[PDB]
Symmetry: D3
Subunit: 322 residues, 6 copies
């Protein structure tokens, strides 16, 4: 297949984390499919279809843990598959792909804005909020509550090894929100003064577990310990359909040099191994609510989001497979 | 008073953490008093006594949290005080100081070796041990168990912000112990595969609480969560006499530029504050045993170590005060 | 608008708690809209519509915490509103108000009887049951169990500050049920002998939390500590629609002189503040089941009752608004 | 009245536990109805209908606790009853009974197979799995994970008093799976080395509680203590519809001589009573997932399985009742 | 036999709770013995000895639960008994009684002062403290922290049925301390805002359990739930020696008319029983420290206080017994 | 050495468990050293010393887990050793062996009686008590309570694999105590009706952990879940000195054919391994008190019993070593 440059570059940027965060990765995948479709020099429906399948596979094979990425490719490719198999001609097939992409992208933006509005109602004047990593859905909540006049402060954890917390601290301070920045290890120490914990998600499973940046689960555990509300801000496309049929979520292991720079690491002895898991699993007993664009649910209702939105597709193969 | 150079330099090195770890800080303080005494050009007992009081105050005012430092100065200064007040002449007073210092220093070395031997009996062939920071008492335990032929591995957490875990990983690997190095945030994720947790202490309180490097308490919490043994390796001079009469232990707050380098931090906006607590408090319910040079105790027997060894001195003022 | 006397009187009696209990308040509110529609001297539909709107606002601004009140008002006014906007003449609009209110009242009564039949199946012969406040729904359960010939005893807590427990003790004893009356403080001490706890609700939230009379959450906490089943008897109109989209339930703060009578309180020093929250929040982890007129549910299924009964109205404004 | 000997023999064998296991019991009851219908010498539909009702009652009165049995009888009898009341003639009613019986049996076999395929995806290479009693649904899970090439080992508890664990041990070993066999008392002692607990169910209630062989609740309690996953493998026909309306599940008390043999027991004095409950109740907080043939659910979604499959029947009497 | 009216009046006042609080009751008993000895018209030592024994018995039979009372009687009577049996003459035995009484009283006053000084060091500036009942030992703590210039605020629970919280509220406010006054039921609701719980004790047992005013156990349970420190301020004479040898502490059941006044209660039907326990048992896992006049201890060191102070007396009968 | 027949026989009977129970084993071991000293035909002290050493080694290499055995051996042999090294002639050494052994036996018997008197004070009229295995110390408690006229019932668990519970059930019933006999698996199911749990010990460690018959820790876990008091009746010679200096208690693994009789086990597949741990470890958090002959202690005071009774011997070698 003739795959445009933009697919390869998007995929590279997803792998190296120049494009990061689960929502954004998903939109970048949709965007990459859109562009494959705009620029295809294919002449028959079958050549575009083959290109879109191949592009989808390229994009799916970047980072495994955030289900947002394949849910975006499915959103597009289910619709493209149905049009192709229904006898669509070339320009019809192209436009199904382009318009599906745009639609996912728009709904993603709108879901995040609505999660903001719903989640902000739970934030109260004077609240100290602790967060972790950098999540646009969680930030949407904190930004909105501040826009409503509530005087909040946010405790931002630095989020080793990639320092996502620096992104969050700078962004929240740019909206005028006072920030306290701490190392991850200090989360129990400051949990007494915290009123709420607001974090994002990469995948949410059928039984209510949340997969999110390495350390989330520790934060949640000590939050529960201290009876501090744990709120997870997550779009419907963070819910993981394959877990309904027993699939385990793969935890991505990333390069040890994100932890210890190559310069330093090559001087270390062989009998030291560096392990660098980028995500951990938080069980539902430590989460009080998930804030989606359709409402607040307990984590044990994740299964209902999945049955409503994604169950239908589980009988079929992935829409990009042969 | 005429204070020798070595007192000022020791104190500076303690403050900047070029001399670090609670045991070592204490020995460096004893050592500094020893040298003030060796080199004093005082002519009367009262001039040396005044110099030793002043030196003690200099040393006490470096870092507040590890009670090892004042317990060492007390060990020396109680003995010096009693000799001075008993009418000691100059050379007698000098030697009381020098010999007391040496004695603390020797007993410290021997206590750590014995903690090693006692703690190693609790480590079993095949054990995966998790640790935090860099503690010579904890390391003594792991080194000894490896010397006994037990095939162990150690999970070393990096210990932000000062990276003490790098010291530990390199030291344990130099003895031939296989090391797995992880960020602090990954401690819950790897707690399932961990058999034992072995950490040090800076201060242990009357009710059994352990004050140790920022993050210890999170590690302990998730250890308890997973029914993983939490063992604290601590010399008797880590027990904190003033807590028997209600004293709270001060948590040292260190410079924000240890978290975010000055180059980067000066570019950040004013409405971000960086908080850098160097220690946290682990309650006794999350500790299974303390390994001292006199045995294994439950954390609730800390009070007995204190009553035996230090209660006597609480009626009196600090031995270096006027 | 020409608001009839029974509306003002009902509103004063809800406010002063001469009419109290969440179900009874809701039925009284529907009865008041009923009497307004009956006696209105309106000539136009637009005039009666406007009277019912104003009556509704009066009734809604009485006590904030029990969502039964607005759910009753909505039940009548969604129906009145749809009639009005579909051109109903005067007598059609009138009958729609009167009939919808009678429907609400009749369904409320049947729901309570059915809650009793369902809940009584979980009560066993010889059971000691502890309750709190005065809940018609909880009493329905206990009364039905006793009529089945189960030999029960009920421990009734006094329920400060308003003494609702006196109502409960005399009601149960007048049905022939043996009663043990205790102070709220004694709930842990007698939890060892209790087999079941049965309490009502004022509001149940999307995440499964139960808002009920101050003290409820303490009793639930210690029931859970002791593995004593906590059952909340509640009608579907106790479920709180706005919590689906993030709203917090307002906790009513009633007058200090309910706690300390005015004649005593005026003599107390100024630096004493009396705080009188009329409700607390029991988290779903301390509740075993909610008994609704449609069946036994776990508390985390509250979101399903809400989705199916109330979710449709949330995109619209309140049916009594301009 | 003219009941074939296969109905009586099936009943005897259920009661004596020659036919045992909840799914197998349900298959054997459907089969017994099948045979009554095939061999009936009835000449009129009302007479066949009577035999099916009497045979249903005889099979229902065998063992109380596993709801699979009545759910099987209902599956056949709801269909038979609708055909009888719809005017079906003899051969039509006969066929309805035979074919409904056959479908239940075939659905049961397929459901156990699908549970295996779904549950096996949760099992990872190198897993130690603990199980209890003998459950074909739990075994299907382990058998499929092993066929996928996962090197698992299974800890099998003996399961007093009837020794069902001997069946499990010999069966898993015949498939190639290594087994560690222990007494029920040792389950906490080996919970440290276990990665997963996989058990079956007799009845699952509307609140998510699982009723299973005596001792299950203990294993789940200590598994929870240790953060070991508890997975319950259970077909939809193990869900108990009467619990939706408050019914308590009856715990079967079996003969004391299963505990102590008759010869020994008759020598014991009369102030010893032997108590032999065959099942216990595990609360939903100690269960991570239930694996049904429709997917993985949190136990709190048991109510959703009940609503969509069984709720409809609750307004009617039992299809075998007069 | 010739008992002075002050003994009888002291006893009446203890029984009616005109003299109340464990420490005050013990002081009043020592004082009553003092007065019997001062005013005795006995002419022989055996006759004074008899009066002291009879008066001890009368004071012992007033209120059972607070061990301070018998410990005060023992303090005086062990000394009196050793003087009588050592041959003391009249004036010698008289003086032994007077002076032992005086020492107990003076030691009690000093002990409460020292508890204040020790406990106040645990209180930090800005602390919200919750308390229960009226305890002079707990109040000494708050009063001293305020005198040190810590801006504290105290949540005082009303303490039904005798309203001891009104004493506490008015007393702390008279010292300048702001008070929030609430019903006992609201303790969980305000536990989120509380930094510390500070209560007293009637008896502390050999296993670390604290027996204190009804409701204490509830407050400690929810404090533990919230990670709020529970501190018990208690003199050494609140430790219960008979528990070392297995004795159960008797929980006083007081008149029902303290709960419901006589006038109302006589109108109630006979199938209502009012139960009025005046104390409950808080287990040691819910207590962080006991603050004695000898220092801070974990509750598990209660046995050490008992061993060193009281153990000696357990082989003897009560010093007032024949 | 000329070892008498009774030593070899006693050692075989400990090994085969014809002599079992930790206290009884200890008394049998002392009785065997006694008989060796009685019948020895030694001529020199050095010869008898050497016989007693060898006899001791034989007796110690029988069963490893109950420290009562070596503590008995030490009791006799510390004394024999000190006599020998202080020049005792033949008859003096002999008498020292015989007398020390008789002293151990007499003190063991008195300790058990006294444990009974102390423990029975914690048992109340109407109590349901659950026990496990067969512990003379626990039986002493129950038997004394029943002789005081407390109307108790005892739930006795069968205690697989060796059925020690049959011994317990018949012993208690022969004293007139009502007995309910159940399988170990049923302990959680009947924990709701139990008021107290009373069990023995084999070894108690420095950190407060109790090593007792397999299953003990499970019963303790669920007692704790249900707030049922767990009391361990144990003599001071059940406390384990070497744990003070870090030693782990060896858990005895007994023969697989205790679980599955040889005639059945030889027919089972090779990939089944039967594991038969005779003991487990109950952590101190699940124990309320230890009842020793010196009084009630919390489990965390085990270290005090050890320090005062046994600590002195730890710097020396075992008194039967070369
Ligand atoms: O764990 C991360 C980022 O992972 P990484 O940095 O590894 O992509 C974020 O919390 C989620 O992705 C959700 O973010 P959002 O709410 O922005 O979707
Ligand atoms: O918390 C630290 C180091 O603090 P820092 O790096 O701030 O000195 C170590 O665990 C203890 O000091 C004990 O170490 P040791 O066992 O070596 O005394
Ligand atoms: O909290 C209360 C009463 O509040 P108040 O007395 O302040 O109105 C009752 O438990 C519920 O309202 C339920 O009662 P019911 O089941 O009767 O609706
Ligand atoms: O409790 C038992 C057997 O009871 P019994 O031995 O008393 O029949 C099994 O775990 C379930 O019945 C599940 O079995 P399956 O998964 O085979 O249905
Ligand atoms: O329980 C009470 C009072 O009981 P009552 O009101 O029944 O006497 C107090 O908390 C303690 O007695 C401590 O008091 P203090 O610290 O004053 O000794
Ligand atoms: O664990 C057992 C017996 O082990 P076994 O039967 O394997 O010897 C008993 O509970 C203790 O030994 C205490 O018994 P006692 O209190 O009688 O010493
Ligand atoms: Cl709310
Ligand atoms: Cl051990
Ligand atoms: K907090
Ligand atoms: K582990
Ligand atoms: K109970
Ligand atoms: K495990
Ligand atoms: K708090
Ligand atoms: K119980």
């Amino acid at each position: 297949a003739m795959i445009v440059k933009e697919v390869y570059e998007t995929a590279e940027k997803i792998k190296s984390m120049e494009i990061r965060g689960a929502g954004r990765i998903a939109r970048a995948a949709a965007q990459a499919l859109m562009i494959q479709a705009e620029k295809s020099k294919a002449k028959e429906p079958e050549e575009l279809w083959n290109e879109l399948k191949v592009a989808s596979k390229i994009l799916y094979n970047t980072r495994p843990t955030a289900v947002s990425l394949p849910n975006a490719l499915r959103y597009v490719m289910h619709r493209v598959k149905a049009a192709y198999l229904g006898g669509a001609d070339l320009e019809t097939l192209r436009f199904t792909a382009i318009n599906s992409a745009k639609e996912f992208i728009y709904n993603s933006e709108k879901a995040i804005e609505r999660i903001g509005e719903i989640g902000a109602k739970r934030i109260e004047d004077g609240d100290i909020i602790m967060t972790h990593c950098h999540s646009k859905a969680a930030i949407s909540v904190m930004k909105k509550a501040f826009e409503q006049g509530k005087n909040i402060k946010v405790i931002v954890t630095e989020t080793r090894p990639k320092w996502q917390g620096k992104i969050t601290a700078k962004e929240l301070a740019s909206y005028g929100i006072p920030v306290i920045y701490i190392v991850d290890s200090a989360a129990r120490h400051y949990m007494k003064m915290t009123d709420k914990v607001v974090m994002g998600a990469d995948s949410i499973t059928a039984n209510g577990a949340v997969i999110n940046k390495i350390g989330t689960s520790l934060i949640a555990l000590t939050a529960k310990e201290h009876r501090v509300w744990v709120m997870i801000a997550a779009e419907t496309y963070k819910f993981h359909p394959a877990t309904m049929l027993g699939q385990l979520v793969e935890i991505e292991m990333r390069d040890p040099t994100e932890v210890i720079p190559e310069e330093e690491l090559r001087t270390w002895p062989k009998n030291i191994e560096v392990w660098n898991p980028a995500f951990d699993v938080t069980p539902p007993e430590y989460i009080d609510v998930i804030i989606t664009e359709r409402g607040i649910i307990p984590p044990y209702a994740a299964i209902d989001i999945l049955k409503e939105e994604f169950g239908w597709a589980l009988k079929y193969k992935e829409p990009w497979e042969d």
